Amino acid sequence: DLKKIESYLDKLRIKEKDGEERKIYAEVLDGRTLKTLYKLSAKGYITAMGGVISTGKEANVFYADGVFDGKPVAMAVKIYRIEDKMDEYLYGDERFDMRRISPKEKVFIWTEKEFRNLERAKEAGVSVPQPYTYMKNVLLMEFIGEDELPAPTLVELGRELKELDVEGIFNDVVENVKRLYQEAELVHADLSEYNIMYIDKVYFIDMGQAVTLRHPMAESYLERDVRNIIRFFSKYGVKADFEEMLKEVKGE
Numbered sequence: 366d367l368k369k370i371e372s373y374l375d376k377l378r379i380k381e382k383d384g385e386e387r388k389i390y391a392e393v394l395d396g397r398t399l400k401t402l403y404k405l406s407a408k409g410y411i412t413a414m415g416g417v418i419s420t421g422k423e424a425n426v427f428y429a430d431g432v433f434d435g436k437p438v439a440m441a442v443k444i445y446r447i448e449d450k451m452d453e454y455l456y457g458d459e460r461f462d463m464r465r466i467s468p469k470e471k472v473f474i475w476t477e478k479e480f481r482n483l484e485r486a487k488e489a490g491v492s493v494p495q496p497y498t499y500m501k502n503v504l505l506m507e508f509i510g511e512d513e514l515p516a517p518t519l520v521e522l523g524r525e526l527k528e529l530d531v532e533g534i535f536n537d538v539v540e541n542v543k544r545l546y547q548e549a550e551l552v553h554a555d556l557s558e559y560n561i562m563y564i565d566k567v568y569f570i571d572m573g574q575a576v577t578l579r580h581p582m583a584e585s586y587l588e589r590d591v592r593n594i595i596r597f598f599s600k601y602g603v604k605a606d607f608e609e610m611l612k613e614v615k616g617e
């Protein structure tokens with residue numbers, strides 16, 4: 366319960382002096398997840414958990430210092446809550462549509478799916494965070510940002526985009542959608558200003574729902590992604606045609 370939580374927080378060196386992190390961890394993570402994090406720490410993948418980056422309805426995201434490839438890396442640790450709507454994105458994906466989606470296994474299969482989508486995208490040259498490892502409902506990946514503060518998402522940039530190469534940023538997004546579709550053969554299926562981050566270039570995040578092109582709604586998901594992106598960049602002065610961008614992505 367609460368004693369079980371405190372021991373793992375102590376073990377993870379998540380201290381009260383660190384602001385509200387400890388109170389947040391203790392509420393958003395349950396005993397089973399904390400144990401998994403401790404397993405990853407004791408195995409040597411995690412050096413030290415840090416700040417809480419995001420708390421959500423499906424997942425929570427934390428900063429961590431860890432080790433991957435025998436080097437110390439800044440990590441984002443993305444954790445799916447052990448406890449619906451996502452199902453069309455799970456069933457109907459060929460890689461999972463003949464598998465046993467048990468209720469008590471479902472969240473773990475989702476985490477796995479995101480990890481495999483990250484590897485798939487990354488290896489096809491799409492800008493996503495380098496995936497490092499995963500265990501149960503825990504994903505360890507490359508931290509996008511510096512000095513423990515996450516790069517802004519596009520929506521967090523907002524008007525600041527007018528102070529940037531907004532057309533260039535748009536073209537970066539389109540090029541990544543095109544690589545995702547053509548080389549990785551995936552459709553993001555929830556692409557928006559809420560899951561594109563920007564440092565010196567764009568990175569796509571939140572790939573749990575991405576489906577291969579063999580998913581029967583894949584082309585519908587794509588056009589939804591493309592319309593979504595064009596409409597968002599329209600607010601910041603990017604003039605783009607749906608037809609042309611969709612053809613560009615698909616290779617027509």
Ligand SMILES: N#Cc1cn([C@@H]2O[C@H](CO)[C@@H](O)[C@H]2O)c2ncnc(N)c12
Pocket residue numbers: 418419426441443494506507508509510515516518559560570571
């Ligand atoms: N996947 C992932 C990540 C999510 N986030 C954060 O959580 C928020 C929720 O999406 C987002 O607004 C961003 O602020 C990340 N931050 C740094 N590196 C990462 N790899 C991630």
